[PDB]
Every structure is written in C-alpha cells, then in structure tokens.
Design a protein around this ligand. Structure first.
Ligand SMILES: Nc1ncnc2c1ncn2[C@@H]1O[C@H](COP(=O)(O)OP(=O)(O)OP(=O)(O)O)[C@@H](O)[C@H]1O
Ligand SMILES: Nc1ncnc2c1ncn2[C@@H]1O[C@H](COP(=O)(O)OP(=O)(O)O)[C@@H](O)[C@H]1O
Ligand SMILES: Nc1ncnc2c1ncn2[C@@H]1O[C@H](COP(=O)(O)OP(=O)(O)O)[C@@H](O)[C@H]1O
Lengths: 48, 673, 92, 288, 180
C-alpha cells in the first residue's frame, strides 16, 4: 500500500467525465500518500 | 426520483431542497448482479462468465463507434438475462459458454450500423478464443412462410437482407415491450412491419396496427388537458386509443405506431409505460394498466433529440440504405408490367433499362461537375420519380393496346429520365449533362440541334420526333391588366407537358399524384400554375388556393382542408366533392422551423399525402379519423439554401420536383399587348 | 447382367439444395482476405452480405473426387457380386 | 370468490372467502380466509372489511408459519407456504440461528457458530439441486429463484461475518428481522431504525439483488425516515433508483404507488395524492 | 484542405501494421488503423463545417443571401475572443476542441491535430511520441493497445479479460517494445 494513484483529466475542468485512466505513482520518501491526496495532485492534459 | 439536467428541466426552489436528503446513485455495480443472477438460474461456470459479460460490454461501450441510438446499460443486460433463463431450461447440457456467446451476439446484432459489425465480432473473438463458431438458431415456420406472401403480392421482390431484418424484428418483438425502426427514408420500414403482421396473422394469432403522427397534433391534445374556459376535462387522443386497446377479452394484438420525429417533450412522459411499471399515468389522476395484448412501436427516422432515458427503455432495429437497393424496386415494377401488359413489354423496356440505369446514374452525381444540385437528395427518390414519369409516358399506348418496337422505347426512356434527374440543375450543368448523354447514351435529337439542348425538345406520341412550339393566342377584348391575364409562353407549355403526365396517372403504388416546382421569388410560379388551373373543367374538376406564412399552425391547415371537402367522404358521402379537387400551395418552406430543427406544420400535410385523413378535434369524440378518398396536390418552392428554409426530408419522397428557370425571352412576352 | 453406374460431372455430380447447403455448412477454409462466421451469412468487409462462399469451387472438386472414390467402392462391391454370380452360374 | 349465504327471508348475500392473484392465463396464487367478508348495503363497508380481514388473516398465518419454519424443516414449509411468508421465514431463521451462534462464541471459543453457518451451506445444496431445474408453473417458478438469490447473498455474508457479538457493527448493518412473541408482532430492524411489517398480500414478485450500493441506500433511507423526511435519490438514467425504492417498499410489507409528473400538472391533483398518502399509510414515488 | 474518403480509404488500406517484421500491410485488422480512419472521419466532419460557415458568413455582405440569425451570432463571435457556439456544442452535445481564443489556440490546436494526423497517414509510418491531446477519444487508443498486446504476444496464452494495466515513468531526459 506504499503506492499512490493519480487521475488523468483531459480538460482542467476536472469532472467524472474526461477521466481517461488512472496511474500509480510510487515516489514517497517520508510523506505518506494521504499527504498527496489532500494536496490534490493530478496529471491533467491541456493547460487552460 | 428526479433526473439532473436535460432539456426541459427546472430547479427546485430552496424552500423544497430542505426536506429531502440526498442519495447519489451514479455508477451501479454490474458484476455482482450478473453473477448472482446466473446463480439464481442455476449455472455452474458463474465467476468466469460474470467477468466475460462485464469486460465485453465495457469494451463495446468505449472503443466502438459513437452513434446516438446505441445503448449498453443495465436494461439491455437484464433483457439478456431474462432471455438466458429458458436456454438453460432446455434439455441441452452443452457447455454454458457456447450458449452464452450465442445469446449475447444474437441479441446485440440488430442495432449496429454496417461498419461496426466487423469490429463487434472481431472483439467477440478476443474473449472466447476456445469457441470457433455457432449457427444462429433458425425458426423454420416463419422462414418458410415469408416467401409465400412475398410472392402473393404483385410488386414484391424477396432478397436475403429482408429475411435477416424481418427475423431480427421478430426476435426483438418476442423479448421486449416496444421497439423502434430507425433508418433513412425510402428504406422499406413500413413494408417490413406490414409483412410481419401478415405472417403472424397467417398461422392464427391475428395482429392489428394503428398509426399516429405526434408533431402534427399538440401534446395537450395528444394526452388531453383540463379545459381552459369551462373548467372541465377533455379526453386525450393517445390515451383514448390506449383505453380502447388494452381491454381483455379481445383477439387482436394491437401495435400502436407513432410516426414522426422524437422530441423529448412529448415522448418522455411515457417512461412509466415503457419501464417495468408498464402503467400509464395522467394529470387527470387516471391510471391504466398495460396488458400483453398491446405493443408500442415507432417508425422514426433517427434520434437526434433523445436523452439515454428514452434510448435505453425500448429495443431497436436499424434499416440500412443498401438493404433494399433501388434496383430491387425497379424489378418490382417490372413484375407489375408482366401482370397484364405482359406481351413482351417487361423484357423489351428493361433490356435498355437495366444497364442504362445501373451503369449510368452514379456517373452524373459528381462524375461531371454538377455542383449545384439545388435539392440535395438520396438518389432512390430520383428512381421513383423516373419510374412514375415513364408509366405516364406509356399510358397512351397502354390505352390503345398497341405494342411498339425497341427503338421507340429507348427514346422514351431517354426523354423520361432527361427530366427528373435534369430537373434540379442550371443551364450550364444542363449542357454538361447534355454532353455526357451525347458521349455515352442513346440518340437525342440530332436533326438540327442548333445550339438547343435535349431538354428543349420532346418525344411525340404520333411519331419518333423531337419538336416543340407554343401556340398563338392573343387576349379577350377587355383591357384590365387581369383581363390581360397571361400569354402562351414556351416555359408554361413545357410545364403543362411535364405536369399533365403525372397528374393523369391513377394512384399507382409509389405515386401520390402530387407535384412540386422550384423557382426563384418571381420566376413564373403562380403564372404557369394558374395557366394550368384555368384549363380545368369545373363540371368534373375543381380547384382550391392556399398560401403559407411563418405562424400558420396545423390547426389552420386542418381547418382549411375540412372547409374544402365539407364532408367525410369516407362514410359514403360528398356528392359535390365527387368531382376531383386539387389543393395548391405556393411555398411549403415558410412555416416556422422549431428550435430543434423539426418543423411542426408540414407533418399534417405528410399524413394527408401518405395516408389521407387525420384525427378530429371537435371536443366530442377523439379516437377516429376522417378519410379523403379523393384529392390532388401541388406545390412550389423558392430555391432552398442559405436564408431559405427546407422541407422535411421524409416528405421529399412524394412530390415531383423540378426547377423553374427564368425565361430569357422577355422581349417576346410583352410584344402582343 | 448386373453392373454399377459410372459417376459423371453432368448428372451424378448435380448437387441437390440439401447437398449444396451441407457442403457449404462445412465452411472449411478459403478466407485468405478474412471473412466472418458462416453461421448465418458471410460478409466481405463491413457488414455486406456475400451471395456465396468465396472459393466454393475447390470444395466442389474435392467432394467430387471423394464421391468418385466412393462410387469406385460401390463398383468394387458390385464387381465382387457379379463375379460371384458368374462363378456360381457357369457350373450348372 | 363469491359465496351466497341464504339469510332467512332476505336474498342470499354474497360473501368473499378467498383471494387470487392471477398472472398470465392459468398460473395463479390462491389464499384462503378463515375470517370472512360479507357484502352489505354500503360499498365503503365491505371494502373496508376486505382490507381489515386480509390484514388479520395474513398476520395469523404468519404467526403460525414462524413456528412451522423451525419445526418441519426447510423443504416442507417452503413448499407449503406462499412466497412472502416463505421469504420472511428464511430471514427470521437465519437471524435467530446466527444470533445463537454469536452468543455461543461469547461464552467461550466454540464451533457452534461454525455449525450454524455450515447448516446454511447445507441448505443451499438441497434448495439448488431440485427446485430450480424442474418445476411446474410460472408463479411457482418465480418463487424459487426469489429464495435462491437471497440465500446466495446470505451465505456470502455469513462466510466473512467476523463479528464477535450482536453489538458489533458488522452485524448491525443488514436488514435483520424479529417476530416478537411476547407482544405478538413483527419488527424489522436496521442499524437503529425499526418498524412493523404492514401485511399486504403481494404474492410472488421478482425482487432484486443486493449490491453494496443498495446497502448504502437502505441505510440512508432508514436514517432519513427516522428523522421524518423523504429520500430523493439522483443520478443518470438506468441505475436502479425507482426499483430500489419499490424494493424497500416490498420488503417492508408496504404498498407503493408510483406516478409520473409532467408539465401539464396542477397542484390540486398533487394535494389529492398527498391526502391519500397521509390518510392510508402508503408510500409514494413521484417519478420524474 | 479536406481529405476525400475515396482517397483516405485507399491510403489507410494500403499500409498498416503493429511491427513491420511481425505482419504485412493490412487495414481493418489492426486496431490503430481503424482508429486512424475514425479520427480522420471526425476531423473532416469539423473541417467541412468550419469552411462552409466562414464562407456563408462572408457571403452575406460581400456575397448575397437573406441574413440569418446564426450568421449574425457568428459575426459577433468572430469580432470577440470566443469562437461561435456553432463549433463547440449542438442541441444535446458535440464538444470538439473548446478552447478560449478565436484563433490563438483553437485553430492552432486544430491545425496541430491535423498535421500530426496527416503525417500519421500520408507517410503512413507510426511515429514515436504520440500526442494524446489530439485524439478525440483517448480511451480507444489505450484499449486498442491492450488488444494489440494480447494478440501479438502470448497468443492463446493470454486472454483479454486476464490482462491488467500499469505504467512505468521513464525517468530520463534523453533516449518498439510493447506499450506507447
Ligand atoms: N419487396 C419489395 N420489392 C419491391 N419494392 C419494394 C419492396 N418493399 C418495398 N418496396 C418499395 O420501397 C418503398 C417503401 O418505402 P417505405 O414507405 O417503406 O419507406 P419507409 O421506410 O416507410 O420510410 P418513410 O415512411 O419515411 O417513407 C416503396 O416504393 C415500395 O414500392
Ligand atoms: N406568360 C405571361 N404573360 C404575361 N405576364 C407574365 C407571364 N408570366 C409572368 N408574367 C408576369 O411576371 C410576374 C411573375 O410573378 P410570379 O411568378 O407570380 O411571382 P412568383 O414567381 O413569386 O410566384 C407576374 O406578376 C406576371 O405579371
Ligand atoms: N441492483 C439491481 N438489481 C437488479 N436490477 C437492477 C439493479 N439496479 C438496477 N436494476 C435494473 O435497472 C432497471 C431499473 O432502472 P430504473 O431505476 O428504472 O432507472 P431510473 O432510475 O433512471 O428510472 C430494472 O430493470 C432493474 O432491474
């Protein structure tokens, strides 16, 4: 359970729609994944 | 159970959001339900098969082509399950996965357009590689019965595509409440329904069919409302048919057919009837329970204003343009020609027709430029048109019982199809057309052809000649500009020439006996039409005039036609309407197109032309229709495109359409006066 | 006399609709381009019905060869029968 | 049925003696009555008596059936009783036996909880083997797999049901039932909420599977009803809203009345509906 | 310019494969070729509409036609930053490439999409470094990759429902096998 899972949104509007796929991103160090979850990271596609 | 966000959906004012507590149901589970249902039937390969179902339906949803009418939700899945009970209940102990592949594939074939079928079954192969193929379980009685009545009719050619589509319709009828026949114009939908009803009736178990047009009547009238004057209820048409149909202790099996567009506002309040509740509910407070005696069908062209809440409620079947090619229709007409005029004509006429039509029509659309076909169309309409013209062409020699050589017939076909594919083009495109016909077709006039097109001349009944003229005629002595009504032009005479042929034909199948001109605003529309109309004989042939504006409603057109006939000529009435009448309209375009794109006035006309009659609205009785046993119809267009509207495409199949150019001779119109 | 009949491409080879349907139902091979299930209908490319299996003729030839061998088996049995009748009869 | 009882000098009065639910043509379910209902001069009277006497006989047949369930054994009472009572019997058996196992665990480390779970597992094979493959009639058919689906979910929960005692949340998450004897009455239970069975004859109805999402709805709606509100679920089309509502109605013994609002409505008819709802005791589901 | 389907169907049928060694040229069978055809189809559907409406917007004043309300809305949108609604939405929904500027990014994005799609077609060779934003339906791309791996590799040893997904981030600036 050391692995963190991110979404991939097409537009930066961020709804249920536009969720293409989900990506595991293990790179943790000292900060547990919930830190990142509250931080609301994401891998969007466009930039607007 | 509100539904967040569509067309025609308001919000709850904040006084009312207080009471209710929310429950967010976005994604249902789909695997556990399937596996426990398969357990409930009593299968043994549960857990693998469940994953198979889920993955197949997912993949089909995402990576397949996007079409509006496709659905793969839970309604489809449950339909498959309630199907799959019986197959295991049958004696076979064969391996379950075979039975299941067969069930899924054979269920989901019907809706798919041409291209998606290879992708679908290529996708099937990637999940059941153990299984190679299975035959489709074929029902012997119906497949042997179908050709019998297809031969019983005169004008019916059996083709394999019809077998496939009609059997698919039979299966979806067997499973689900209601269904839709999505597919483009002139594709044979109504015929398919009719023939199916016939085969069901042949082996006992009768079947009756009713028709309706939803956007040629107002929804308030369709389901009835409370009167807005006297504070008292009025009955609703569709609900009256419902109550009249779902009585037990009958022998029919009624199929209520709606026929028009699918706009969300009127359809969507039938969710309860099309859902598993299968109960109708009214604002009256009246609740009527469905029976198995009744089914609901829609002969609609295609959905473009439908939310999934109505796509997923009912099954569906897709007709394609290539299922019934225009050639098959030609062969049906040929079968009719060998009915009575069977001396040699079918063979002789066609011996040019087949190659002269198959290997020619597609070399006119864009082989040569032809880049201004003012009326965009599908070419089957052109074929119906030329056939209807040719029948009128040969009507005279049918009358005298005279049979002609091959060469005269070839000339006749050249003349027939010169117009009716040349009727939608301008002089430049017409000369390019003419050069094509010179290059690779049967002879056109060559005696003089002094910078005059093939259109200019006509074939004469008395002999094989290409001449034309306009007879001299001056005026009466009166000096009113009206008394100087109109003069005998060339354009008018050729217009009468074309019109009269169709207008003499006596109500053949594929003939509505209806015409339509196209010309610019101020290009001799009412002129030529009125020149024709004066020539009527009011002792056995009458006439009526009407005009169109944007805010003319179906109730207005209803009123004028009712006042025109003044009688219900269906119930053995109208001595004075026994003479033949004509309805003339200047401009069918102008009525206000609705926001969606589907105008709501022409539909009354289309139910008048196609079938004659309509439903009454006189606050006394509802489910019943007046009948027109005799009428005639003529129209006139204004060069549609750009700012000018266009008519519904479903309606284009019936009217003879052709251009009305400017005269280019106006030095010679005003000479006499 | 007693004897068997020779096969023929003209008459004996004439396949009945039942024979035609079963032979097509074998659906052995020949789908080099790539064709779909023969369970109901063959389709060339995108949902387009084919009047017949593409290379049907080779299957006809193979079945004719097999049937000629079968007729040779019937003729061999008939030859044994005819020779037996001749052998028994000639003694008297 | 209508049986004429010939009163002296009065024309014989027709009285009801049994009730029937017909589905299809010949397949049907019959229910006798010991308490009878007699026609009269006032229509409201014999309609009211029909309702009451139905409720009373349903209650008494259930009160018996709850003893018969554990006395006779699985097959006999499932074959003997009607569908509604059969499903109630299965649920009450399972909750009582599972309870008994849980206390027996509380006393000391015991296999008896495991023996009860094994008993349910054994019941599964006998129900699944025979009554599913061969059977006569549509109504009788629908009854069986209605039992089967419940039992599948039943054993699936009971496999992983690692709760030490009744107070544990994992046990206090499902729709349990208790037919109280000392005060003779049904009572259905959720996390906290409780309510009595409403005794409406429905016969065999095709109730549905229980995904976890349906559990979320059940808990939510029980809570909302405990605070005197009305659930208003939402989402996209075809996710099981109306049918989930109807099933929570069906399991609780009540009768639901779906309607269909549309733009051509007026508040007088809604008032009529709501007056009927408050007067009767029924549930409303204003679809769309 | 447009891409006529009589040419495009040809060109897509002429060349296609996951790996030149693994398979000879082919059309329908390989998922990425059918994806090429679908994407070209939708792209042309938008290209025709834009060309036509620009024309008929300018052919009302310099040209002649009875003025439309839609065309007036288009004129107003062209003056402002926002593109007209005619190129984003439809009565139900037809989202294409909704970006802010009239031409600063919108037509820029459409041009880039068509450029990559053409070089993905005219040469016909599969380039490296696919641009995910350009595809109208990204998910079909990924599931086609799945199907490709199932067929080409471990075929059958691997079933479609057995396969699961994962990703390794190429932690490198400076740089085929399965994946994209
Ligand atoms: N078996 C057949 N053989 C020859 N011609 C046929 C056959 N079946 C149908 N046709 C012809 O096809 C046409 C049927 O068109 P149809 O009225 O079915 O169109 P539709 O699919 O109902 O759409 P719409 O209602 O909009 O016209 C008629 O011209 C009919 O003569
Ligand atoms: N044969 C004719 N003789 C005399 N005048 C004619 C003739 N044909 C057309 N005109 C004149 O040309 C005009 C054309 O108008 P019209 O065709 O009625 O408009 P629209 O084409 O919109 O129906 C008429 O008003 C008529 O006076
Ligand atoms: N958990 C479930 N078990 C069984 N069937 C279900 C389940 N969820 C949804 N369904 C099916 O979905 C259909 C009901 O959909 P419905 O709730 O009417 O859609 P909507 O909520 O949009 O009206 C029924 O066929 C029902 O059986």
């Amino acid at each position: 359970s050391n692995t963190y899972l991110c979404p991939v949104y097409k537009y930066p509007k961020r709804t249920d729609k536009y969720l293409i796929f989900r990506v595991g991103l293990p790179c943790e160090g000292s900060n547990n994944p919930s830190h990142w979850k509250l931080r609301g990271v994401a891998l969007l596609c466009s930039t607007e | 159970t509100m539904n967040p966000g569509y067309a025609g959906r308001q919000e709850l004012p904040e006084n009312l959001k207080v009471l209710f507590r929310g429950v967010s149901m976005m994604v249902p589970d789909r695997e556990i339900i399937i596996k426990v249902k398969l357990a409930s039937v009593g299968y043994l390969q549960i857990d693998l098969l469940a994953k198979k179902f889920n993955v197949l339906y997912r993949l089909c949803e995402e990576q397949l082509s996007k079409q509006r009418h496709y659905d793969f939700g839970l309604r489809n899945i449950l339909s498959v399950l309630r199907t799959a009970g019986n197959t295991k209940r049958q004696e076979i102990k064969s391996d379950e996965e075979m039975l299941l592949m067969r069930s899924l594939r054979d269920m989901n074939l019907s809706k798919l357009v041409a291209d998606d079928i290879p992708l679908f079954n290529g996708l099937l192969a990637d999940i059941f590689p153990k299984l190679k193929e299975v035959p489709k379980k074929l029902y012997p009685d119906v497949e042997k019965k179908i050709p019998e009545e297809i031969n019983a009719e005169s004008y019916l050619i059996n083709t394999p595509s019809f077998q496939l589509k009609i059997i698919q319709l039979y299966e979806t009828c067997l499973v689900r409440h209601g269904f839709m026949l999505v597919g483009p114009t002139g594709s044979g939908k109504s015929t398919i329904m009719k023939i199916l009803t016939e085969v069901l009736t042949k082996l006992g178990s009768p079947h009756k069919i009713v028709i309706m047009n939803p956007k040629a009547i107002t929804a308030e009238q369709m389901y009835g409302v409370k009167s807005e004057i006297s504070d008292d209820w009025i009955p609703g048409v569709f609900s009256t048919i419902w109550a009249k149909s779902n009585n037990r202790a009958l022998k029919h099996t009624t199929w209520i057919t709606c026929d028009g567009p699918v706009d969300a506002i009127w359809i969507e309040n039938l969710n309860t009837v099309l859902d598993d509740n299968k109960i109708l509910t009214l604002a009256n407070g009246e609740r009527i329970a469905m029976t198995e005696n009744c089914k609901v069908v829609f002969e609609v062209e295609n959905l473009n204003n439908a939310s999934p809440a109505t796509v997923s409620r009912c099954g569906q079947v897709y007709v394609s343009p290539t299922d019934l090619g225009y050639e098959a229709v030609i062969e049906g007409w040929i079968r009719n020609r060998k009915a009575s005029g069977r001396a040699e004509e079918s063979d002789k006429l066609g011996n040019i027709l087949r190659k002269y039509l198959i290997n020619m029509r597609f070399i006119e659309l864009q082989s040569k430029e032809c880049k201004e076909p003012m009326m965009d169309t599908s070419p089957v309409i052109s074929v119906i048109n030329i056939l209807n013209l040719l029948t009128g062409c040969l009507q005279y020699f049918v009358q005298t019982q005279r049979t002609l050589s091959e060469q005269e017939y070839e000339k006749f076909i050249v003349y027939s199809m010169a117009w009716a594919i040349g009727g939608i083009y301008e002089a430049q495109d017409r000369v390019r057309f003419h050069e094509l016909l010179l290059a690779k077709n049967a002879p056109i006039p060559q005696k003089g052809k002094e910078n005059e097109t093939v259109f200019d001349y006509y074939v004469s009944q008395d002999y094989l000649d290409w001449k034309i003229c306009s007879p001299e005629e001056w005026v009466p002595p009166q000096s009113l500009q009206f008394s100087q009504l109109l003069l005998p032009t060339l354009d008018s005479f050729r217009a009468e020439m074309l019109l009269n042929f169709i207008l003499t034909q006596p109500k053949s199948h594929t003939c509505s006996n209806s015409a339509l001109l196209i010309g610019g605003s101020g290009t001799a529309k009412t002129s030529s039409v009125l020149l024709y109309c004066n020539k009527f004989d009011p002792q056995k042939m009458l006439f009526k005039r009407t005009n169109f504006s944007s805010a003319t409603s179906p109730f207005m057109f209803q009123s004028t036609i009712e006042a025109e006939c003044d009688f219900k000529v269906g119930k053995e009435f109208a001595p004075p309407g026994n003479k033949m009448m004509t309805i003339f309209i200047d401009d069918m375009s102008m009525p206000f197109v609705n926001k969606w794109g589907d105008q709501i006035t022409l539909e009354l006309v289309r139910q008048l032309i196609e079938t004659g009659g309509f439903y009454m609205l006189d606050k006394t009785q509802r489910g019943n229709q007046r009948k027109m046993k005799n009428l005639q119809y003529i129209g006139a267009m204004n060069h549609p495109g750009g700012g000018r509207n266009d008519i519904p495409n479903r309606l284009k199949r019936q009217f003879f359409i052709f251009n009305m150019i400017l005269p280019l001779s106006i030095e010679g119109i005003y000479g006499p006066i | 006399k007693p004897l068997n009949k020779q096969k023929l491409r003209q008459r004996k080879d004439l396949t009945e609709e039942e024979i035609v349907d079963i032979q097509f139902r074998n659906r052995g091979e020949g789908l080099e381009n790539g064709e779909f299930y023969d369970g109901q209908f063959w389709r060339n490319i995108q949902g387009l019905i084919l009047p017949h299996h593409p290379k049907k003729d080779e299957f006809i030839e193979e079945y004719l060869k097999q049937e000629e061998v079968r007729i040779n088996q019937i003729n061999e049995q008939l030859q044994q029968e005819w020779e037996t009748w001749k052998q028994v009869y000639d003694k008297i | 049925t209508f049986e004429s009882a010939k009163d002296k000098k009065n024309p014989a009065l027709k009285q009801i003696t049994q009730i029937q639910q017909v589905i299809g043509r010949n397949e049907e379910n019959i229910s006798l009555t010991g308490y009878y209902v007699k026609c009269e001069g006032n229509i409201e009277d014999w309609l009211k008596k029909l309702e009451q006497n139905m409720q009373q006989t349903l209650k008494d047949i259930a009160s018996a059936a709850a003893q018969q369930v554990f006395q006779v054994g699985l097959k006999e009472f499932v074959s003997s009783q009607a569908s509604q009572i059969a499903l109630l019997g299965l649920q009450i058996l399972w909750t009582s036996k599972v309870n008994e196992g849980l206390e027996r665990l509380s006393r000391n480390e015991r296999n008896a909880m495991d023996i009860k779970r094994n008993e349910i597992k054994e019941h599964m094979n006998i129900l699944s083997s025979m009554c599913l493959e061969d059977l006569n009639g549509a109504v009788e058919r629908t009854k069986v797999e209605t039992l089967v689906t419940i039992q599948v979910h039943q054993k699936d929960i009971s496999m992983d049901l690692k709760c030490k005692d009744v107070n544990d949340f994992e046990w206090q998450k499902q729709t349990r039932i208790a037919w109280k004897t000392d005060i003779d009455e049904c009572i259905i239970s959720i996390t906290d909420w409780d309510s009595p069975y409403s005794y409406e004859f429905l016969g065999a109805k095709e109730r549905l599977c229980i995904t976890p999402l349906t559990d979320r709805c059940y808990i939510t709606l029980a809570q909302a009803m405990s605070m005197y509100y009305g659930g208003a679920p939402a989402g996209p089309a075809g996710t099981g809203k109306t049918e989930t509502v109807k099933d929570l109605g069906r399991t609780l013994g009540v009768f639901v009345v779906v309607t269909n609002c549309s733009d051509q409505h007026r508040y007088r008819d809604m008032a009529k509906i709501f007056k009927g709802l408050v007067q009767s005791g029924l549930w409303g589901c204003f679809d769309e | 310019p447009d891409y006529n389907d009589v040419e495009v169907r040809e060109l897509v049928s002429k060349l296609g494969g996951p790996n030149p060694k693994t398979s000879t040229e082919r059309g329908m069978t390989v998922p990425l070729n059918i994806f090429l055809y679908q994407e070209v189809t939708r792209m042309q559907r938008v290209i025709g509409l834009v060309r036509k409406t620009l024309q008929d917007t300018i052919l009302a004043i310099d040209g002649q036609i009875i003025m439309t309300p839609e065309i007036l809305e288009a004129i107003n949108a062209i003056y402002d930053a926002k593109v007209p609604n005619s190129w984003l939405y439809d009565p139900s929904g037809a989202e294409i490439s909704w970006l802010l500027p009239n031409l600063g990014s919108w037509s820029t994005s459409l041009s880039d999409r068509n450029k990559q799609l053409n070089d993905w077609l005219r040469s016909g060779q599969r380039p490296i470094l696919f641009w995910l934003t350009g595809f109208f339906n990204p998910q079909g791309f990924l599931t086609g990759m799945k199907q490709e791996v199932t067929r080409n590799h471990k075929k059958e040893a691997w079933s479609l429902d057995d396969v699961v997904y994962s990703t390794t981030v190429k932690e490198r600036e400076k740089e085929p096998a399965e994946g994209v």
